[PDB]
């Protein structure tokens, strides 16, 4: 087992040059350094450690470091260099599962950290937390150039090689080794009956938990689909921007003549301030002086203003009754513009040269094992029920990738699971009601018949209501779904509690398992805990934030892991079936939002093979962990991500 550290010139998007690299070994204890001219020797050392059957320890190695080596070894000296995924291990993917909760334990330490490093899994932040940090390269280089007198141009100091870079690379691999010893000094994930610094890739993976293996496979696959990208159409979103940027410049002209300006106190100094519809103070004032009473006081002196009170508002003047609808449309158009094209993290500021969007996906960002999406967020674009939704999802298509050998577009397949957490509930409470609840879910659709039984208008409203009732609501927040009062908010709770009297028994079981005493304060809550964590489906200590969200962190943390294994198995069957992953093959993953997957493939027969084998992968997931239910999915085929929603 060796511990390697790299340093190159730029990010993985545009990297062309190698600068330095340090290797430490666990059998000779040698800081074997390398130079810019020793890159062949560096690759030979890594290939020797692979060929003898060992493990290479990087940090952030799956996302950046290993494909940087595969790119540099090709485009600098013309040689193929691939590391097998069962040899490379990471110490960031291990940190995101072992220390999954830094924001709730990092206070009391901020005396150590500067303040910008609060809750960071970066390698320098663990240098500050382990009390082993000797300077920083960027600060010392900036201080050096200000001491010489030449300017500091762009914050790009990895242009030229020097000797301080090697020293801070040595300190970097020191911090990586001192992190690895603590991360392997854990006992719940690594049993203390064997030393993990001399075992092979058949002992290290399969003589420990399954959560240490599934997380590395997920990080590998999600880094690969991050490197693939998402095909994007630019002209069809510039047409949308030029369409609805000539609408908010009419909804203000038509509206400031209705709602006039006023003098507001800044001898009494006044200023001529005009009506700004994006503010929620000007609309509150102009509705206060036009004859409207809120009768809803969230704030202690101000009302609440949102889309559910701008519908139930009536005034005397019949012009303002039409003006309020234009105010709501103006707020919608403003949010649409700021998301699509004018924001700091807009869509048109993260399009590469080849017409694709690369978004970072953190596989373990939530406390319940749910992935987060950032820079930009491709799990937050407007759906097909919101206005201007289909015109925003039609640009995010897979038919915008014309093929590089025949000049033809591709086909997209999208696969969604059905009734995921609601069927995990029937898994978990099947030991109470003897499994006569997990038979009605398999007998026809669940949400449609729930809508029939509860006389909700839409299936989406029934689906919102059932999880709102299930994850511990109050008396009003499920009466608000239909708009009625707390009388209906009580009778719906009684109706869906007296049907299956096992949810309260399961909740009492969770309360008797986790909490033992909870003292009551008139403004707070003081609880003596017994077990703050919950064993998940693969032994991972899932952290619990509040004792009334215990059913939540028991259901969604067990629902995310079956999707996380399903996305791995549905390519482990496709590669073994005789296909090729990537753009130069037959299929490519594009995006993984919390439930469904979006894959793009070359022909319709390959689409049919993928949409067949997704079912077999999901059934193998359902058989591997011995669920008491029967898991099932549903797939669609199309050109873009508006039919394949």
């Amino acid at each position: 087992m060796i511990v390697s550290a790299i340093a190159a010139n730029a990010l993985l998007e545009s990297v062309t040059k190698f600068h330095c690299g340090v290797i430490y070994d666990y059998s000779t204890a040698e800081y074997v350094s390398y130079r810019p001219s020793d890159f062949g020797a560096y690759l030979d050392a890594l290939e020797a450690e692979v060929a003898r059957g060992g493990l290479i320890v990087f940090h952030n190695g799956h996302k950046y470091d290993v494909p940087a080596l595969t790119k540099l070894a090709k485009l600098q000296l013309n040689r193929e260099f691939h590391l097998p995924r069962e040899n490379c291990i990471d110490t960031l993917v291990l940190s995101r599962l072992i220390h999954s909760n830094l924001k709730d334990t990092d206070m009391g330490l901020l005396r150590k950290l500067p303040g910008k490093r609060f809750g960071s899994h970066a390698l320098e932040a663990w240098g500050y937390r382990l009390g082993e940090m000797k300077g920083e390269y960027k600060d010392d280089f900036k201080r050096m150039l200000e001491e010489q007198g030449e300017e500091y141009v762009d914050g790009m100091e990895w242009w030229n090689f020097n000797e301080e870079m090697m020293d801070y690379n040595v300190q970097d691999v020191v911090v990586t080794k001192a992190l690895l010893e603590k991360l392997l000094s854990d006992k719940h994930y690594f049993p203390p009956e064997i030393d993990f610094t001399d075992v092979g890739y058949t002992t290290f993976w399969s003589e420990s938990l399954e959560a240490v293996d599934i997380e590395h496979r997920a990080a590998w696959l999600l880094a690969k689909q991050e490197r693939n990208g998402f095909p994007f159409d630019t002209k069809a979103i510039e047409e949308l921007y030029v369409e609805l940027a000539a609408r908010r410049s009419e909804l203000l002209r038509k509206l400031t003549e209705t709602f006039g300006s006023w003098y507001q106190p800044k001898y009494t100094p006044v200023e001529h301030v005009v009506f700004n519809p994006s503010s929620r103070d000007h609309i509150q004032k102009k509705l206060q002086e036009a004859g409207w009473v809120p009768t809803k006081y969230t704030d202690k002196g101000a009302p609440v203003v949102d889309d559910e009170v701008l519908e139930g508002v009536r005034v005397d003047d019949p012009e303002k009754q039409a003006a309020i609808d234009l105010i709501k449309e103006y707020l919608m158009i403003q949010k649409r513009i700021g998301q699509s094209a004018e924001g700091d993290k807009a869509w048109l500021r993260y399009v590469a040269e080849d017409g694709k969007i690369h978004g970072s996906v953190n596989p373990n960002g939530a406390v319940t094992g749910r992935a987060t999406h950032a820079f930009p967020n491709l799990a937050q674009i407007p759906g097909v029920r919101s206005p201007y939704g289909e015109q925003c999802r039609a640009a995010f298509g897979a038919e915008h990738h014309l093929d590089g050998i025949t000049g033809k577009p591709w086909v997209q397949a999208g696969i969604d699971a059905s009734g995921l957490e609601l069927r995990c509930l029937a898994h978990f409470m099947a030991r109470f009601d003897n499994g006569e609840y997990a038979h009605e879910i398999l007998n026809g659709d669940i949400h449609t018949k729930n809508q029939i039984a509860a006389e909700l208008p839409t299936r989406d409203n029934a689906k919102t209501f059932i999880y709102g009732f299930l994850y511990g609501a109050g008396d009003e927040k499920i009466g608000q779904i239909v708009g009625a009062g707390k009388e209906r908010g009580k009778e719906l709770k009684k109706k869906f509690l007296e049907n299956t009297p096992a949810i309260a028994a399961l909740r009492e079981s969770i309360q008797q398992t986790l909490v033992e005493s909870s003292q009551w304060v008139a403004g707070e809550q003081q609880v003596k805990w017994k077990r703050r964590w919950i064993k998940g489906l693969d032994g991972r200590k899932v952290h619990v934030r509040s004792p009334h969200a215990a059913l939540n962190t028991l259901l969604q943390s067990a629902g995310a892991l079956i999707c996380k294994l399903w996305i791995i198995k549905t390519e482990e069957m496709l590669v073994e079936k005789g296909l090729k992953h990537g753009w130069d093959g037959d299929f490519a993953y594009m995006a993984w939002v919390h439930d469904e997957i979006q894959v793009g493939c070359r022909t319709e027969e390959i689409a049919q093979v993928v949409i067949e084998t997704a079912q077999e992968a999901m059934r193998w997931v359902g058989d591997h962990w011995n669920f008491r239910c029967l898991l099932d999915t549903e797939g669609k085929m199309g050109p873009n991500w508006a039919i394949c929603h």
Partner: protein, 242 residues
């Protein structure tokens, strides 16, 4: 840039106040933000107020971000526009009123541009001839895209645009709004838009502002006058020998 949330101290919230890399905090509940003449006119001396223009249409934040402020000195109304440099310091001023009493104070250079102290990287740029059309484009684009304007008029374009060559070299596409023609800029980069009105404000005040924005993102490349190809000349050869 956004980092995380801190608990606020005025409104008492927990996830309302946000911390940033610049050092300032901002709450979203209580909305509290924490931490010639040769005479440059002070903003507080001549009673500088950030007012708006009603008959043409310019919001207050555009005048706050562009440096176009109204003075109430000596009982009259002045519209002072400031010119800045790449370091972010006040260089010169221009005073415009109803009688067009131009008072150019300070060291007015031969390459002065309005709106260059905030915008250095990008792909497109819109170059206009005045100050009202430039603020109109900043109103239509919400003050977030690189738009500059000539501070010397559309008659001396061969001096201001020619002296600024390395500044316009940093961009990929330059789109002009002069007259509805310059060759000192490099080729394959100059685009000229065609408006059905006099300028941008005539399209803004008559409902043609959509045809402003359609000529910003879908402009055409100027093909310099008279370089007519031999194919579109049949009528001028038929009438010549007849």
């Amino acid at each position: 840039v956004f980092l995380y949330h801190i608990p606020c101290d005025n409104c008492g919230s927990s996830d309302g106040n946000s911390l940033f890399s610049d050092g300032h905090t901002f709450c979203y509940v209580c909305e509290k933000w924490t931490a010639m003449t040769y005479n440059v006119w002070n903003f507080g001396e001549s009673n500088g107020r950030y007012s708006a223009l009603t008959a043409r249409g310019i919001s207050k934040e555009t005048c706050q971000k562009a440096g176009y402020w109204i003075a109430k000195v000596d009982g009259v109304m002045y519209q002072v526009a400031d010119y800045r440099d790449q370091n972010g310091n006040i260089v010169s001023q221009k005073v415009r009123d109803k009688d067009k009493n131009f008072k150019t104070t300070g060291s007015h250079k031969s390459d002065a541009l309005f709106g260059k102290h905030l915008w250095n990287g990008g792909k497109k740029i819109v170059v206009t001839e005045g100050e009202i059309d430039m603020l109109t484009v900043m109103e239509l684009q919400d003050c977030k895209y690189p738009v500059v304007s000539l501070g010397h008029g559309a008659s001396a374009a061969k001096k201001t645009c020619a002296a600024n060559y390395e500044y316009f070299d940093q961009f990929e596409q330059i789109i002009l709004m002069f007259d509805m023609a310059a060759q000192v800029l490099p080729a394959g980069k100059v685009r000229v838009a065609v408006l059905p009105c006099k300028d941008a404000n005539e399209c803004h005040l008559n409902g043609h502002d959509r045809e402003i924005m359609e000529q910003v993102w879908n402009a055409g490349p100027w093909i310099p006058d008279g370089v007519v190809s031999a194919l579109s000349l049949r009528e001028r050869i038929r009438e010549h020998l007849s």
